Amino acid sequence: KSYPTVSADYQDAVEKAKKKLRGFIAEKRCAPLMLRLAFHSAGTFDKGTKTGGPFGTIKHPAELAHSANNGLDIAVRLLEPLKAEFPILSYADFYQLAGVVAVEVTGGPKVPFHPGREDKPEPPPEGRLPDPTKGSDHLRDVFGKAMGLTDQDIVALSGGHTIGAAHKERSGFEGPWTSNPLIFDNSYFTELLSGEKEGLLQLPSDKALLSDPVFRPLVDKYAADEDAFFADYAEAHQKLSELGFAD
Ligand code: HEM
Fold this sequence. Notes:
Heme b 1 binds at residues 161, 165, 167, 171. By secondary structure, this protein is mostly helical.
């Protein structure tokens, strides 16, 4: 990574937008949606072709219409008046900043943030985000092969589901992973380990972590050691927020 220089005015806008985003996301109870927005923005990166990734394209109707993005229109429209207060910021940075803030305000680790991503004109093709009905090979095709993230990243990042819930009108899955879906903690992993449970969701892709010999040791470590989860989580979210950026 070689991070670009931005003006002092750009930096001031980042700092002030970070603060506004905290109060906004906290009062609106939308941290999970905003984290999902940031992931769906970044996760389309394909290292092979250098296409996709966290470049502001998620606001384009063409990208909002991807079925994986059901409901992200709401996230995008919720942020528009606040974004209008910071016209200097790229959409790319703004949506990644909303992701970082979503983790922080729910009590998660502080993910280092570097400004300067440029807004690209071209949304990636649909079909690159993970499929919750699939298993380990698939997650490795999505996170490893396309994104260029590690197996440690895959498991730590699945920890993002520690906040939030699925919606039957969005993915078709329904419910929270955790009893405290607005609190950033290691509950995702402890829930996974205690198996199926009334009124908590587990996806087939979550189950795939429990039977992989590389993913399972990590699920165990995060279930047992929240600090270790926070540190690996922060590292993985940083890498994710920076795919294709500043290489
Ligand atoms: C590992 C592959 C992944 C799969 C298969 C997956 C799948 C899903 C699905 C199906 C939903 C439900 C959407 C809905 O119906 O509202 C969801 C929600 C969510 N995902 Fe993921 N996801 C993955 C990775 C990630 C990552 C890496 C993050 C970011 C750290 C993330 C953050 C979230 C959040 C915050 C929600 C909750 C949204 C809300 O409460 O409205 N996910 N995910």
